[PDB]
Write a protein that binds this DNA or RNA. Structure first.
Ligand code: K
Ligand code: K
Ligand code: K
Ligand code: K
Ligand code: K
Ligand code: K
Ligand code: K
Ligand code: K
Ligand code: K
Ligand code: K
Ligand code: K
Ligand code: K
Ligand code: K
Ligand code: K
Ligand code: K
Ligand code: K
Ligand code: K
Ligand code: K
Ligand code: K
Ligand code: K
Ligand code: K
Ligand code: K
Ligand code: K
Ligand code: K
Ligand code: K
Ligand code: K
Ligand code: K
Ligand code: K
Ligand code: K
Ligand code: K
Ligand code: K
Ligand code: K
Ligand code: MG
Ligand code: MG
Ligand code: MG
Ligand code: MG
Ligand code: MG
Ligand code: MG
Ligand code: MG
Ligand code: MG
Ligand code: MG
Ligand code: MG
Ligand code: MG
Ligand code: MG
Ligand code: MG
Ligand code: MG
Ligand code: MG
Ligand code: MG
Ligand code: MG
Ligand code: MG
Ligand code: MG
Ligand code: MG
Ligand code: MG
Ligand code: MG
Ligand code: MG
Ligand code: MG
Ligand code: MG
Ligand code: MG
Ligand code: MG
Ligand code: MG
Ligand code: MG
Ligand code: MG
Ligand code: MG
Ligand code: MG
Ligand code: MG
Ligand code: MG
Ligand code: MG
Ligand code: MG
Ligand code: MG
Ligand code: MG
Lengths: 217, 173, 159
RNA sequence: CACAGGGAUAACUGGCUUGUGGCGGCCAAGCGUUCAUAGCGACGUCGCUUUUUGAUCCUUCGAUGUCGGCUCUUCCUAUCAUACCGAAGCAGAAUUCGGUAAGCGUUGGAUUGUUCACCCACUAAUAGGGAACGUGAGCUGGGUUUAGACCGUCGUGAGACAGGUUAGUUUUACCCUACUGAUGAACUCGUCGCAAUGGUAAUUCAGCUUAGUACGAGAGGAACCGCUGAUUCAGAUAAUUGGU
RNA sequence: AAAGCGAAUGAUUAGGGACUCGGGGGCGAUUUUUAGCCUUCAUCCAUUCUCAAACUUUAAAUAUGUAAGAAGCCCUUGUUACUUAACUGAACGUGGGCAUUCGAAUGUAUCGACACUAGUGGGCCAUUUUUGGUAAGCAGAACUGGCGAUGCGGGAUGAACCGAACGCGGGGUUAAGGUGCCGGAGUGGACGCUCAUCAGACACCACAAAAGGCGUUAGUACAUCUUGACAGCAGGACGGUGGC
C-alpha cells in the first residue's frame, strides 16, 4: 500500500472530511502538536520564528509527523528540554481515496474495468495556501541560530517550496514587540496560563478593577 | 525620447458631506499623457480609498530638466517582483537628466534580472550632490582624477553594399 | 430520469429567515386588490394552501380575477422558442403590491401640472428625461488646500 | 452447423498513460569496537524506463497466418569477462565501491512442447535487452484451437469443463523493388598507371623464469621485462595422411 | 465565490482559575467527608491553535422578473338579478377637458399571419466553470465559439490554433508572421547577460524534477579598518604561580 506521494500532490477535489456519510477512515499519523516546555510564561520566550508555505498543495499526515520529529530532536540536543516551545499549526482533515483494481477484480473477478470506480478511504492530508504558516517556535533571543537551523533541516521532508520568517511580534501574541512593552507598563495585561488577557474598558467597573489593579492606580 | 516626467494632481469627487476634498500629487514617468493618467490611478488605488469612477484629474504638466548639459550622478530606489517574492534595490547611474537615468534603469533591470516594466515600482530618484555620496565601484572609477584612456582594436566603418575590398583593412584608427 | 417533485430544490427559498418565524403580521390580510393591478409573488413557507409553484417565486404579473381569499395572476413563461401565457391562483399571503409602476405614476401627474403651469405662464419646458451628461468647466482653488505628495512604499513582512 | 452485417464491439502488433513491475537520486535518526556518510540508510521525499501486468478502444472482421524451438544479421548500455585507472575498516593473497569505455566474446548436457526453472561439467566469463512480444510463399508441428474416442465432476436430458488422455492434409513466385553475382551502347583500337569515395580484423588463455623472492610473528604468498605453446576467428593451399 | 467558529449544529490542539463529594491513588491515628495534607482524571468559567459537497449569523461579481402613456390622465353621471345598513361599491360607458411638447438612449441592412413539404434524429474540438479516476490522444455535464459543410496568408508538416471567410480583372495599403542564404525584405540602431568535451534559438506543441557549484553578474543584512584592517615575512611571549 501507500502509493508514492507524487500521486496526491494537488488540491483537485472538494474537501472530503470524515462524517456520517463516509465511515471507516484510518487514524491520522500525527497526534501531538505541542512539544517542549509548553507552559512557560509569555515573558520568558520573546523570539518567534515561522516556517511558511509558498505553494497551493497538499501535505500528508506522514510528512507532518516526520518533520515534527526531526525538528524536535535538534532543538532538544542543542537547547535543552526547557529552552523552547514548538507548535505545529496545520491539521489534516481531507481524506483521499483509492480504487483497488486488484483487490476488487484480481482473483475476485466480480466486475472489472472502470465500472463502479468510486474508491475507498486511504489516508489524510492537509490543504495549505500561499503564505500559510506551518510550524512555529518560540524561545529566547540567544537561541536565534539554533531555531533557524532546526527549521531549515526539517523542510527536506516536505514537497514544494517553503521559507523561514522571523516574526516582529512578541512570542505567540498578535502584538508588536515595542507596543507590547508599553501596554504592560500601563498595566493593561495580566498573566494567564502561558498566555495573557487584555483590558477593554467596556465591562462593569468592579470586576475590571479587581482583575487589573495596576491599571487604575 | 521614450519617456517624460509628468506632474499629476487628482481629487475625490466633492460631496455634500465633504465639499472641498483633499488634493494629491505624484511624479510619473511615462511615454505620453494618456498612460500618465492611467498610471496615476494605479498608484493612488493602492494608498487611498479612491477610484477613477469616483474622482477626477485636476492638472497635468510636463517637468523639464533644469540643466540638460551638466553631467550628474543619480541614485534610485525601487521595488520589483522576481519569479518568487518581492525585493528592494538601490542602483546608480551617470548622465545629464532624470529622464535619461530612468530609461537606463529600465534596460538594466531587463538585462540583469529579467524584470519587465509591469513589475517595477519607482520609489525615489535623487541627484547625488557630493562626490563622497558615490557608493558603487562602477561609478567611482568614472569620477577618478585626471581620467584618460585609449581605444584599441577599433573596427573601421565600411558600407554594407561594398563587397569585395581590394585591401586588408586596419584596426588602428 | 432523476427525481422531480413539486418542491424539489426549495430548501432555502421557501424557508423563513433567521429570527423571522411565528406570527404573520395582520396588515397582509387588510390590503385590497383590483382587476388590473401589478403584483409580485413571494412564497411564505408557513402557509401551505394556495401555494404557487417554485417557478413563479420572484416573478411579477397582473391580476385578472378576485375571489374570497385569493387572486388570479397572469405571467409569461419562456419555453424554448416562444412565450406562453400562464394563469395561476395564489392566496393573498403570497402576493404583494409592487412599486414597479409608481415612478411612472408619479411622473405622469407631475408632467400634467408643469405643462399647465407653463402654458398659463408662457415659457416652454422639457417634460422628458435625459441621461447623465459630461461635466462642465470649473476652477479649483489651492488656497489653504495645498496638495500632498505621495510615493509608493517599500516591501516589508507583516507576520 | 447456416445467412445478413459490424472495426458502432472483445481475443494478437502498433498509439496515449504508468497505478503495479524494474531501475536511479535528496535529507540524515541509526549501524559500523571509538567514529552519520570505508561499506550501509529508518521516518519522509523527487525522478527515470516501456523487455511485467493492468486501464482505454484510435486503426484492421469483402482476413495483416495466432506458442516454442532451429537458422542468420544488426543495434542499445543500466558492464559478466578482457584494456588502463581512482577509493577502502586496501601488510601480501583474495575481495568490495567507483570512472573512461559496447573494440572483442559470452558454451557442452539429464527432465519438461515449453517461455520460465533446477541440477551435472568446462571456462577469462558462462551479462541484461530491441528490431510488428524480429524471423511459417524459411523449416518443423511437440502444445493450443474443428470434425472420431475414453475418464472424473456437473446436468432428468441434448450436452458443459481457461480438468487429464490418444489419433488428426501446413498451398502459389515466372512480376516490381531490395540483395548477391554477370554483360554492356556513345567518344579510333590498345599497353602501362594514379586514387576520390566505399569496406576493413583479430581474440583470449597456459607453461618456464622472475621466486618460495617482495609483504607477513606465522600460516601463506604476487607483479613488469624475457622464452615456448595452445583456444575462438579470418584468408589461402594439396608435397604428405585420410575420404570419394 | 469569498467569509465565520472568544455565533447555533458538527470536528479539533494546549495551558490556567474554581472547585469534592464525581471517580482513582494515596499521606497526619488509611481513623473518620476529618471536602485535615495532598494528588491525577472528570465538571464549570474566562482564554487559546486549526476545519465543513450533503454546516451557518453575514454575503458579492456575472446573469435574471416587471415598467418607462392616447388601449394614457382628470371632471360630471347612466344599467345590474352581484356587493353594501345604505346608489355605498365593482365592472362596463355618454358628455367635457389636456400636445404651448404623445413624455429615456441607439438602430430599424428587413412587420404580421397562413399553407404544403425535404433532410436530420452515431457527432467531435477549445478558453473559463466542473464530476469519476494514479493518470490517459480516458469516461461524463453548463454558457459561448468552432470543425463537420470551407477555400486563402502564417504555425517547415499538421480537420479544430493565430489573421481573415471567397463573382472575373488592374492599381494602392495592410493583418498574423517575417527581413545572413535557401526566400520577397536590414549581415539596421541603443544598453547589458552568456563560453556549454551535451550551449541556445518563439504561444497551442511535440517534455523534465528534488538537490548542488569559491563559474560569472547584480542585490540584502551584520561586523572589522588610515587611532593602520585581511595575506605573507620578522621579533617578543614576564613574579607570586610547581595554584589551592
Ligand atoms: K466486461
Ligand atoms: K521542501
Ligand atoms: K437524486
Ligand atoms: K470492415
Ligand atoms: K473506421
Ligand atoms: K512507474
Ligand atoms: K512496452
Ligand atoms: K502497456
Ligand atoms: K483493439
Ligand atoms: K479482423
Ligand atoms: K532448444
Ligand atoms: K503483424
Ligand atoms: K513462430
Ligand atoms: K494432444
Ligand atoms: K494415425
Ligand atoms: K520475385
Ligand atoms: K573509413
Ligand atoms: K586498414
Ligand atoms: K577452407
Ligand atoms: K593432388
Ligand atoms: K584420391
Ligand atoms: K462571515
Ligand atoms: K463551531
Ligand atoms: K434588475
Ligand atoms: K344596490
Ligand atoms: K421533419
Ligand atoms: K423525423
Ligand atoms: K458515435
Ligand atoms: K474521445
Ligand atoms: K496551415
Ligand atoms: K549588427
Ligand atoms: K549564482
Ligand atoms: Mg476529482
Ligand atoms: Mg435535483
Ligand atoms: Mg392538504
Ligand atoms: Mg461479414
Ligand atoms: Mg475502433
Ligand atoms: Mg514504483
Ligand atoms: Mg553510533
Ligand atoms: Mg527508503
Ligand atoms: Mg484488408
Ligand atoms: Mg503479410
Ligand atoms: Mg494475406
Ligand atoms: Mg555508462
Ligand atoms: Mg567496471
Ligand atoms: Mg539438446
Ligand atoms: Mg514490447
Ligand atoms: Mg514474433
Ligand atoms: Mg516471413
Ligand atoms: Mg499436435
Ligand atoms: Mg476433438
Ligand atoms: Mg459426434
Ligand atoms: Mg448423472
Ligand atoms: Mg506454409
Ligand atoms: Mg578510406
Ligand atoms: Mg622474512
Ligand atoms: Mg589415398
Ligand atoms: Mg468556501
Ligand atoms: Mg442512424
Ligand atoms: Mg469527452
Ligand atoms: Mg469514446
Ligand atoms: Mg457526416
Ligand atoms: Mg473555417
Ligand atoms: Mg498554408
Ligand atoms: Mg512547428
Ligand atoms: Mg492586389
Ligand atoms: Mg528583427
Ligand atoms: Mg533576398
Ligand atoms: Mg534550482
Ligand atoms: Mg594582521
Amino acid at each position: 500500500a501507500r502509493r508514492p506521494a507524487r500521486c496526491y500532490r494537488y488540491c483537485k477535489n472538494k474537501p472530503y472530511p470524515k462524517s456520517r456519510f463516509n465511515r471507516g477512515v484510518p487514524d491520522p499519523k500525527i497526534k501531538i502538536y505541542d512539544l517542549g516546555r509548553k507552559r512557560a510564561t509569555v515573558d520568558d520566550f520573546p523570539l518567534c520564528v515561522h516556517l511558511v508555505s509558498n505553494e497551493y498543495e497538499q501535505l500528508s499526515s506522514e510528512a507532518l509527523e516526520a518533520a515534527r520529529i526531526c525538528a524536535n530532536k535538534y532543538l532538544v540536543k542543542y537547547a535543552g528540554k526547557e529552552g523552547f516551545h514548538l507548535r505545529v499549526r496545520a491539521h489534516p482533515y481531507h481524506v483521499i481515496r483509492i480504487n483497488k483494481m486488484l483487490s476488487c477484480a484480481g482473483a475476485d473477478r466480480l466486475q472489472t474495468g472502470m465500472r463502479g470506480a468510486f474508491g475507498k478511504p486511504q489516508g489524510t492530508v492537509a490543504r495549505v495556501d500561499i503564505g500559510q504558516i506551518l510550524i512555529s517556535v518560540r524561545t529566547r533571543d540567544s537561541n536565534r541560530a539554533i531555531a533557524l537551523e532546526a527549521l531549515r533541516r526539517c523542510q527536506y521532508k516536505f514537497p514544494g517550496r517553503q521559507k523561514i520568517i522571523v516574526s516582529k511580534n512578541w512570542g505567540f501574541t498578535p502584538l508588536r514587540r515595542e507596543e507590547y512593552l508599553e501596554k504592560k507598563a500601563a498595566g493593561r495585561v495580566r498573566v494567564d496560563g502561558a498566555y495573557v488577557q487584555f483590558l477593554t474598558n467596556h465591562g462593569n467597573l468592579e470586576e475590571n478593577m479587581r482583575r487589573f489593579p495596576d491599571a487604575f492606580k | 525620447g521614450r519617456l517624460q516626467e509628468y506632474q499629476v494632481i487628482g481629487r475625490h469627487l466633492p460631496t455634500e458631506a465633504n465639499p472641498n476634498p483633499a488634493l494629491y500629487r505624484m511624479r510619473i514617468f511615462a511615454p505620453n499623457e494618456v498612460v500618465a493618467k492611467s498610471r496615476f490611478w494605479y498608484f493612488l488605488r493602492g494608498l487611498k480609498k479612491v477610484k477613477k469612477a469616483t474622482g477626477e484629474i485636476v492638472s497635468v504638466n510636463v517637468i523639464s530638466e533644469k540643466h540638460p548639459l551638466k553631467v550628474k550622478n543619480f541614485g534610485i530606489w525601487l521595488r520589483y517582483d522576481s519569479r518568487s517574492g518581492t525585493h528592494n534595490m538601490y542602483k546608480e547611474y551617470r548622465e545629464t537628466s532624470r529622464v535619461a537615468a530612468v530609461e537606463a534603469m529600465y534596460a538594466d533591470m531587463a538585462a540583469r534580472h529579467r524584470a519587465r516594466f509591469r513589475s517595477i515600482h519607482i520609489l525615489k530618484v535623487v541627484e547625488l550632490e557630493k562626490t563622497e555620496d558615490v557608493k558603487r565601484p562602477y561609478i567611482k572609477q568614472l569620477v577618478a582624477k585626471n581620467l584618460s584612456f585609449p581605444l584599441p582594436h577599433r573596427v573601421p566603418k565600411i558600407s554594407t553594399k561594398k563587397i569585395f575590398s581590394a585591401k586588408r583593412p586596419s584596426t588602428f584608427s | 430520469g432523476h427525481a422531480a417533485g413539486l418542491r424539489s430544490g426549495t430548501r432555502y427559498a421557501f424557508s423563513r429567515g433567521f429570527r423571522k418565524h411565528g406570527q404573520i403580521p395582520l396588515s397582509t390580510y387588510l390590503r385590497t386588490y383590483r382587476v388590473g393591478d401589478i403584483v409580485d409573488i413571494k412564497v411564505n413557507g408557513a402557509v401551505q394552501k394556495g401555494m404557487p409553484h417554485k417557478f413563479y417565486h420572484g416573478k411579477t404579473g397582473v391580476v385578472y380575477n378576485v375571489t374570497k381569499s385569493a387572486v388570479g395572476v397572469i405571467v409569461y413563461k419562456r419555453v424554448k422558442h416562444r412565450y406562453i401565457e400562464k394563469r395561476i391562483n395564489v392566496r393573498i399571503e403570497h402576493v404583494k403590491p409592487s412599486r414597479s409602476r409608481e415612478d411612472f405614476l408619479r411622473r405622469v401627474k407631475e408632467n400634467a401640472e408643469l405643462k399647465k403651469k407653463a402654458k398659463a405662464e408662457g415659457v416652454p419646458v422639457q417634460l422628458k428625461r435625459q441621461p447623465a451628461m459630461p461635466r462642465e468647466a470649473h476652477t479649483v482653488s489651492i488656497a489653504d488646500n495645498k496638495p500632498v505628495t505621495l510615493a509608493p512604499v517599500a516591501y516589508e513582512t507583516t507576520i
